[PDB]
């Protein structure tokens, strides 16, 4: 977008106030992604901030050729997948919305991720592919599997 990229040029030259504009634009969606991935207010908030802080600190390595939201979504996505895995106790050895949230957590994180981006966040199969760094064909598979596991959890609500 013209608004956003003009804001990114401004932060890279010193304007930290331009970055707050970027945070304000994406905070809801990024926090939404983290929260629907983790199911936990304190973890989602921590991870969502970490996403933006890391976005700022790595901003001179971002190609303005490419879409900024993809890049930011990818940071947040990697940070949340990271926490879900290290949450598993043995990692280091080698209401209605609320009810659907608990079901979402029972999905393996590869299908959880595509379901959240597709159905809660309304992103295209193309952008998901770029976000996760996989071809559109692979995304479709995971969506199909995710849909299936999701149907098992939700059909009786």
């Amino acid at each position: 977008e013209m608004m956003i990229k003009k804001r990114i040029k401004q932060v890279k030259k010193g304007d930290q106030d331009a970055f707050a504009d970027i945070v304000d634009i994406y905070k809801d969606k990024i926090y939404q992604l983290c929260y629907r991935m983790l199911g936990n207010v304190h973890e989602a908030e921590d991870i969502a901030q970490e996403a933006f802080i890391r976005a700022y600190v790595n901003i001179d390595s971002f190609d303005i050729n490419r879409k900024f939201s993809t890049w930011l979504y990818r940071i947040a996505t990697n940070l949340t997948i990271d926490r879900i895995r290290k949450k598993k106790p043995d990692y280091y050895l080698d209401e209605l919305s609320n009810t659907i949230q608990q079901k979402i957590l029972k999905l393996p994180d590869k299908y959880r991720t595509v379901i959240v981006l597709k159905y809660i966040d309304e992103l295209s199969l193309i952008e998901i592919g770029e976000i996760l760094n996989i071809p559109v064909g692979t995304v479709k598979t995971r969506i199909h599997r995710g849909r299936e596991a999701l149907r098992k959890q939700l059909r009786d609500l």
Partner: protein, 70 residues
């Protein structure tokens, strides 16, 4: 329900069915009640998941982000 028509169900939901294969799927639903219940469960689930898209960041989120920058 056979797996071959369940693949068509997913192709409808992806929004890339061929119009030749769109008429194939409708035949199985009305007739095959096992494939009609399966598709109903998926659409019902998709509809409940979409109703969880209301979440906004915490009140002071961007102040807290600005405070943590190097």
């Amino acid at each position: 329900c056979p797996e071959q028509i369940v693949q068509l169900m997913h192709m409808h939901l992806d929004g890339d069915i061929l119009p030749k294969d769109e008429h194939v799927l409708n035949e199985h639903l009305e007739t095959c009640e096992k494939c009609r219940k399966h598709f109903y469960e998926m659409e019902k689930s998709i509809a409940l998941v979409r109703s969880t898209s209301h979440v906004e960041a915490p009140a002071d989120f961007t102040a807290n982000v600005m405070a943590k920058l190097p």
